[PDB]
Specification:
Elements: E1 3-9, E2 15-21, H1 26-37, E3 45-50, E4 56-58, H2 66-69, E5 75-80, H3 93-109, H4 116-131, H5 155-167, H6 173-184, E6 193-199, E7 204-210, E8 213-217, E9 224-226, E10 231-237, E11 240-245, E12 255-260, H7 264-283
Helix pairs in contact: 3-6, 4-5, 4-6
Bound molecules: ~{N}-(2-azanyl-2-oxidanylidene-ethyl)-4-methoxy-benzamide.
~{N}-(2-azanyl-2-oxidanylidene-ethyl)-4-methoxy-benzamide binds at residues 26-27, 30, 43, 46-47, 58-59, 61, 81, 276, 279-280.
Length: 284
């Protein structure tokens, strides 16, 4: 029974290696990675791979791995798929920990924009969780942490992390991670998956997929939101993506809204993540 080697980049930046039968469905690998991570609240997470166009794709757990990675390497990342709007509701501290690791990468990468003060506050909770109480012996006036906190580090930011870290004496790791999450969950781009698109007129927009619905950034700023309950049908055709809106009160007809995606694969990918968010957040 022939087995394929799988390499998974974990959220701590380390590499998990395992073997699965070459006809294995994604769920098989996901279950192995989640057992490795001692993760029981698996519903929020998934594996990504890179397609032939180097685009991130979710590995569908119901479909054969070989029919998704196709001609590419069996290389994956473990990632948060559904960002919970209220992480305090999660049953396990270890789930909140993995969510913290994902968000730290969201921040350093620039996917999750953050004010100076929030970068320093989030940083100070990470430092408290991982090193415990502030110690002056490790940190002089010229201290720079090994921890990556921001897309661009400044001495000012390092100083503010330390100033807030001092305020957190006695804080336990789960407590610091919960504080991290109470701040992160409020950021305007928390759990927003962004997709480049054009509107029905050809103007460049971003579509954001998240718990609260489909967001349109017709400018650099948000300009429209469609709450999932208002969406009856998500569809794609060629390079186009469509949402069927419920009729407003006393309106005779549903309304259909159309967007142009970079290519057919990008339209299909956007359709699938919207359907998945719609289902997940309808049930949560
Ligand atoms: C709409 O709800 C969904 C939709 C999709 C998933 C999913 O693919 N998770 C990752 C995995 N490998 O199991 C989980 C729940």
């Amino acid at each position: 029974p022939k087995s394929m080697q799988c390499k998974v980049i974990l959220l701590d930046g380390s590499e998990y290696t395992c073997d699965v039968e070459k006809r294995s469905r994604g769920q098989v690998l996901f279950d192995k990675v989640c057992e490795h991570l001692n993760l029981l609240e698996k519903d929020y997470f998934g594996l990504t791979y890179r397609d032939a166009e180097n685009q991130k794709n979710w590995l569908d757990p119901a479909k054969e791995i070989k029919k998704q990675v196709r001609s590419g390497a069996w290389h994956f990342s473990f990632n948060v798929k559904f960002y919970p709007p209220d992480p305090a509701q999660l049953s396990e501290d270890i789930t909140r920990y993995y969510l913290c690791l994902q968000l730290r990468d969201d921040i350093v990468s620039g996917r999750l924009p953050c004010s100076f003060v929030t970068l320093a506050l989030l940083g100070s909770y990470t430092v408290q969780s991982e090193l415990g109480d502030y110690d002056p012996d490790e940190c002089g006036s010229d201290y720079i942490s090994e921890f990556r906190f921001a897309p661009n580090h400044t001495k000012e930011l390092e100083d503010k992390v330390i100033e807030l870290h001092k305020s957190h004496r006695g804080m336990t790791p789960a407590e610091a991670e919960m504080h991290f999450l109470e701040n992160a969950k409020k950021l305007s781009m928390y759990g927003v998956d962004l997709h480049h698109a054009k509107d029905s007129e050809g103007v460049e927009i971003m579509l954001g997929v998240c718990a609260s619905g489909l967001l349109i950034y017709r400018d650099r700023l948000r300009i429209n939101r469609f709450a999932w309950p208002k969406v009856l049908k998500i569809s794609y055709k060629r390079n186009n993506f469509y949402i069927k809106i419920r009729p407003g009160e006393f309106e005779q007809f549903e309304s259909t809204i159309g967007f142009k995606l970079p290519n057919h694969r990008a339209a299909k990918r956007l359709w699938k993540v919207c359907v998945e968010h719609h289902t997940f957040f309808r049930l949560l």
